[PDB]
Subunit: 180 residues, 2 copies
């Protein structure tokens, strides 16, 4: 399953409402079946002077972004062992997870809490929270992320932000389910 | 002084060089002399995912931005003293200089170091450095600013960025002198 012009049309106001609720830029991405990077297909930017402003069609790293890790978290142990064996783990920053054990631990916690969290792993001062959108085969065919600076996505708000992105991704999975 | 598209085209390379050298978004703003405001009229954004991305036509506060304070620094003490007697100043953040004493201090230091510095005074987590551009009558009409997050514009880079923007502004000034009215 996937999107879809009428689906993107449903998705867009969900993204709009999420920007307004979170105060940050929101992205929707799909997965590149390899390199397992997430490609941005839609976005609603916030109006803060400083903000996340990746371009539409921009690609986020597999192991090192909210959207990338959200997708990656849905794969089996052996699937991820094979992808890490193949692609390696480019260090964007000193926080990037470059150890398989550390990455796999973070993926485990991502499944548990319902959102991925990029904590300055792609770029210094940048945080993102993401959740996958699922089809009828429980395949993640898209992910929404909320992306913004550490000065606003503060530690005391991470859980709250995670809740917001869960709810947005859920609304899209439901919307897809409805249109069928 | 007067900016046209053609003049913007002519100085664009200076702005693009500054964005590349600083790694941050570069803005050029003009002073509205009627309404005393700083209006962004061009911009070269950096390629960082997180970056300053004000729109063209955006306004920056006189007392609380790099471009605004660069303009204020050019005014006589009497001129600042008066228009600040007016006249309350909006507090964008806890760092916004809303005390006339404190603002005037900062403007003196601006004149001395050659560049203004907005240290989270417009928005939390945002720094800018700016310097004025002068027309053929040596009148300030524009300002160029480097604007970016405190994650990258760190204390050890403030002086160096100040230097970059002074040099850039002087290059725009020279280029404008050579192409006035284009």
């Amino acid at each position: 399953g996937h999107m879809s012009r009428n689906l993107l049309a449903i998705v867009h106001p969900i993204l709009r409402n999420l920007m307004e609720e979170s105060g940050e830029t929101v992205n929707m991405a799909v997965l590149d079946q390899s390199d397992h990077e997430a490609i941005i297909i839609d976005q609603v930017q916030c109006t803060h002077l400083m903000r996340m402003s990746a371009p539409i069609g921009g690609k986020l790293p597999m192991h090192a972004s909210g959207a990338g890790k959200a997708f990656l978290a849905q794969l089996s142990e052996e699937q991820v062992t094979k992808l890490l064996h193949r692609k390696g783990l480019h260090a964007y920053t000193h926080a990037t997870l470059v150890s398989p054990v550390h990455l796999k631990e973070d993926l485990a916690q991502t499944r548990k809490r319902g959102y991925s969290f990029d904590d300055e792993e792609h770029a210094l001062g940048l945080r993102c929270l993401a959740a996958c959108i699922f089809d009828e085969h429980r395949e993640p065919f898209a992910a929404i992320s909320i992306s913004g600076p550490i000065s606003r996505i503060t530690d005391d708000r991470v859980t709250e932000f995670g809740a917001m992105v869960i709810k947005a991704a859920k609304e899209v999975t439901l919307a897809y389910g409805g249109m069928r």
